[PDB]
Amino acid sequence: KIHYRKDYKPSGFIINQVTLNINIHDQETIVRSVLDMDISKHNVGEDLVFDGVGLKINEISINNKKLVEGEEYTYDNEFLTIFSKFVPKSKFAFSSEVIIHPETNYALTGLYKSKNIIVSQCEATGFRRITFFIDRPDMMAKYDVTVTADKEKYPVLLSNGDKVNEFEIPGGRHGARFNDPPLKPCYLFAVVAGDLKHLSATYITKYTKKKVELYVFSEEKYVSKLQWALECLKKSMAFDEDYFGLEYDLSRLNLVAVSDFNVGAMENKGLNIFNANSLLASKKNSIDFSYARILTVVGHEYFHQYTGNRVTLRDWFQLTLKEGLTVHRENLFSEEMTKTVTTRLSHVDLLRSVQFLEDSSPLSHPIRPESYVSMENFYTTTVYDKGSEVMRMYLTILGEEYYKKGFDIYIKKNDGNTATCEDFNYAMEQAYKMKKADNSANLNQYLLWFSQSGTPHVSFKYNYDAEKKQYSIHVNQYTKPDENQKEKKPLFIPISVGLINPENGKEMISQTTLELTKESDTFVFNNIAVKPIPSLFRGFSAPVYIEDQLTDEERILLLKYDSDAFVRYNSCTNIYMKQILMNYNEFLKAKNEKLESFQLTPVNAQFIDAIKYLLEDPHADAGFKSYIVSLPQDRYIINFVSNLDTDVLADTKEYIYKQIGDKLNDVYYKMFKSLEAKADDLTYFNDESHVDFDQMNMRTLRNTLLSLLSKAQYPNILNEIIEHSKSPYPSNWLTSLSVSAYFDKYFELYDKTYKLSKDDELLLQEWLKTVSRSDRKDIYEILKKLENEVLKDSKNPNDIRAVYLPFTNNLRRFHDISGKGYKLIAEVITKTDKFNPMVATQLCEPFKLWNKLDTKRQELMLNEMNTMLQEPQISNNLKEYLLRLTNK
């Protein structure tokens, strides 16, 4: 069944009130539900059809009378159909009692058990796995929810809204009633039951001075890992107050960590539920990455609230409207909190590798897709991250003042209602008119960012007239046709630009954002005293392929002297890409022609000099430094190479790294040593609320350099690796494991770091990732060992992802020409699909580039996908995904 965006129609029914009784027992959960319903104006005499998946019916009723199966209703484990003649024509009550089984719900959607916690996950279509409903986001209702359970096992009971009663029940049971008066969609329903321990605090809002109770919950074992999350939550509330002027609406906010979770987290009006790996940390038991991760995920779920309780999605095709906007808000927050340029760079790095790959793949879709089969497959980097860049472009175009005005308009015009992407665009259009002082100005073209798939390519030509002091930038845009649009239209592309004086490194013009609205345009600047070097797409101002057409000499100058972090980073990226493409072709030619000898173009010496210059600048940023000594991601590179031979790419990278290392290793070593004091400072190691993003960037730089030195077998570096393994910081001692791969000390550090990791669930998952990603010739044997000794038959998605996904980035080994790596991951996907289709689809990620590889590896991957597609028991999720991915 395929759902089309253009087919939207309001329900012929209304659900005004939901009254739930959820009774949790050892081997079953009984759910009783009364829905106070009505008939809408759009009703035309149709059957009453409820969603309900996997429910065991004890009984159903209309107005307290039992309905009879076959005669009055049918149920096929997916839809409950009540024939219209038995459906009332005014306000009526529908009631049901069903049985569900969270203890065996390993798909982690609906109501399920995670270790000793019962928790729900209803977005997007999970509420129908709990009870019957018209499970769509535009069905708004009031909720009154009662939960009962064994008191010893489940002392803490949580749901949306206010707890209004707590009571004892015979047999050592207890119950709690929660009433949530404001209307909400059912995907925001949540319930939690467990032996939860917590940290708490009180927050006083900025403008109304009201006290908000903040609680963060986990199992008792890890309660000491809750402090950073609580800090992050306070930080999020402060930010939305300061930047957007928005206060929290309710009197309490709960965050709950659970061990088994399909994604990162979920917002549920006051009851936010998190993957433990995105909420829990301690300096002793977490790598540095956890700290930015918790900050962004807690922020993200928090920024969902204000907008979520005023404007609900009309339908799921508007997903990017809530998610792209919330990621944009999350990124603004994260940039302001970390105060490091690597934060924005890391978002760009992710978009241009993972999301660009997706957008040039058979899975390519606009941020507002035209159809879906399985909602779970729609939560993509395109909808989220390209969505966020589209939301961010409004800010670039409008500036802060008018952006913040269009944002307010969108709320006002749409408060209390459902909205669409057009509603948001209309609101910004009003801000655009006010900014341009022109009520004929419009953003109608901007709507193509929602409807048009594929990554635009933007290219440049320049002209300078020295006598006229006149500089011209000629710009061209193009999007490649694909399966979604035969003809692509030009987009509204904002191009933030500067002009750098090559003679002194100074800005030559004020902040300027070119508005490209045609297929091509020419932008002319007068009174330009000398030929500039253009600094293009500052801040990465549009989600596009940038073809800067600059020389490497110009790129080096930008890298050294430009003011914009992204353009410096991109200029470096572009120098590397030119080099990678050149050496790749030279290696490829030698392979194809079976050459006994051949030449390779060396790495630009002035480029190596510039890297040295930056590394040696004490005033330059450590995180930025770690980027400039790293080649572009493999998934970024592949967008530029047809029929990519992964072996040839691996030889290419090897050559380039060795060229630069042969010149700079002594520099790397010196810096690795000199950075130690500040990077590994222990002054605040036992203060869980003290987080220093610069210091963590220094550790990133040290660990990056150590990797480079280890690969290069720098004299006596093993000494440094061994000492590194003794560091209190897990980022350090896990790095010592992965860099020791090049030495016969590896399995000793394997055992040491395992013993350090095994008693913390999340830390062990980081250990697994480190092992999985290790550059080992015997990695296949090592993975087998992990399966047998550690992973076993765990159904925890964190465990499974930890063991397998990092390995799939091993360019040389995962892409083994035998196809053994493809075969291995396909076996894991098919195995996982039996109990968790959402996670099975996640494990398909390496296959997304299948049609970009050399013809042999294309065939190998295709064979595995077709094998998976032929499994009789294949889930709808996995089938849809592989059908789309293989163009069937």
Residues that bind Zn ion (CB under 5 A): 323, 326
Nearest approach in angstroms of CB 455 to ligand R5X is 20
Whether 59 sits among the annotated catalytic residues: the reply is no
Q: For 309, which DSSP code?
A: T
Q: Which of residues 730-769 bind ligand R5X (CB under 6 A)?
A: none
The strand order across the sheet containing 191-194 reads 110-114, 117-121, 191-194, 156-159
Catalytic residue among 301, 358, 586, 761: 301
Is 466 assigned to a binding site? no
Nearest approach in angstroms of CB 326 to Zn ion is 5
Which region among 49-57, 76-84, 139-147, 424-432 touches Mg ion (by CB under 5 A)? 49-57
Nearest approach in angstroms of CB 625 to ligand R5X is 25
Considering only 8, 106, 379, 835, the residue that binds ligand R5X (CB under 6 A) is 379
Q: Burial of 481 by CB count in 10 Å (0-12 exposed, 13-18 middle, 19+ buried)?
A: exposed
Q: Does 264 bind Mg ion (CB under 5 A)?
A: no
**Extended beta strands in 249-347, E state:** 252-258, 265-266, 271-275, 311-313
Q: Does 265 bind ligand R5X (CB under 6 A)?
A: yes
Kindly determine how many residues on this chain lie close enough to bind ligand R5X according to the rule CB under 6 A. 13
Q: Which does 128 bind (CB under 5 to 8 A by kind): Zn ion, Mg ion, ligand R5X, none?
A: none
Cα angle: 138, vertex 144, 150; to 5 degrees: 125
Q: Does 857 bind ligand R5X (CB under 6 A)?
A: no
Q: For 78, which DSSP code?
A: S
Amino acid making up residue 452: Q
Nearest approach in angstroms of CB 373 to ligand R5X is 13
CA dihedral of residues 453, 457, 458, 461 (deg, nearest 10): -150
User: Roughly how many angstroms between the first and final C-alpha of the chain, as a whole number?
Assistant: 15
Quote the CA–CA distance of 414 and 420 in Å, as a whole number.
Answer: 10
Considering only 97, 260, 358, 376, the residue that binds ligand R5X (CB under 6 A) is 376
Across 607-624, b (16+ Cβ under 10 Å) vs e yields bbebbeebbeeeeebbbb
Is 174 assigned to a binding site? no
Instruction: Please give the full DSSP string across 573-637, using - where no structure is assigned.
Output: HHHHHHHHHHHHHHHHHHHHTT-SS---PPPPHHHHHHHHHHHT-TTS-HHHHHHHTSPPPHHHH
Q: Does 54 bind Mg ion (CB under 5 A)?
A: yes
Is 300 assigned to a binding site? yes
Q: Does 816 bind ligand R5X (CB under 6 A)?
A: no
Kindly determine how many residues on this chain lie close enough to bind Mg ion according to the rule CB under 5 A. 1
Is 265 assigned to a binding site? yes
Nearest approach in angstroms of CB 125 to ligand R5X is 8
Q: Which does 266 bind (CB under 5 to 8 A by kind): Zn ion, ligand R5X, Mg ion, none?
A: ligand R5X
Is 276 assigned to a binding site? no
Is 475 within 8 Å of 459 (Cβ atoms)? Answer: yes
Quote the CA–CA distance of 818 and 807 in Å, as a whole number.
Answer: 16
Nearest approach in angstroms of CB 144 to Mg ion is 24
CB hemisphere CA count around 253 (13 angstroms): 29
Quote the CA–CA distance of 380 and 358 in Å, as a whole number.
Answer: 9
Q: Which of residues 123-152 bind ligand R5X (CB under 6 A)?
A: 123-124
Is 558 within 8 Å of 507 (Cβ atoms)? Answer: no
Residues with Cβ within 8 Å of 346's Cβ and at least 6 positions away in sequence, in order, are: none
Quote the CA–CA distance of 381 and 354 in Å, as a whole number.
Answer: 7
Across 530-551, b (16+ Cβ under 10 Å) vs e yields eebbbbbbbebbbbbbbebebe
Q: Does 840 bind ligand R5X (CB under 6 A)?
A: no
Considering only 24, 266, 271, 637, the residue that binds ligand R5X (CB under 6 A) is 266
Nearest approach in angstroms of CB 124 to ligand R5X is 5
Nearest approach in angstroms of CB 836 to Mg ion is 15
Q: Radius of gyration over alpha carbons of the chain, in Å?
A: 28
Is 123 assigned to a binding site? yes
Pairing between strand 211-219 and 252-258?
parallel
Q: For 491, which DSSP code?
A: -
Nearest approach in angstroms of CB 372 to ligand R5X is 11
496 - beta bridge partners? 513
Q: Closer CB to Zn ion, residue 187 or residue 584?
A: 187
Q: Does 835 bind Mg ion (CB under 5 A)?
A: no
Q: Does 10 bind Mg ion (CB under 5 A)?
A: no
Q: Which does 54 bind (CB under 5 to 8 A by kind): Zn ion, ligand R5X, Mg ion, none?
A: Mg ion
Residue nearest to ligand R5X (CB): 264
Q: Which does 260 bind (CB under 5 to 8 A by kind): Mg ion, ligand R5X, Zn ion, none?
A: none
Q: Does 323 bind ligand R5X (CB under 6 A)?
A: yes
Is 724 assigned to a binding site? no
Tell me the torsion sign for CA atoms 387, 389, 394, 400.
positive
At 568 the three-state DSSP class reads helix
Which region among 257-265, 430-438, 812-820, 864-872 touches ligand R5X (by CB under 6 A)? 257-265
Residue nearest to Mg ion (CB): 54
Residues catalogued as catalytic: 301
Binding site, by residue number, is 123, 264-265, 267, 300, 304, 323
Contact residues: ligand R5X, CB under 6 A:
123-124, 263-267, 300-301, 304, 323, 376, 379
Residues of each annotated binding site for Zn(2+): 300, 304, 323
Question: What residues line the site for Mg ion (CB under 5 A)?
Answer: 54
Residues tagged in the binding site annotation for a peptide: 123, 264-265, 267
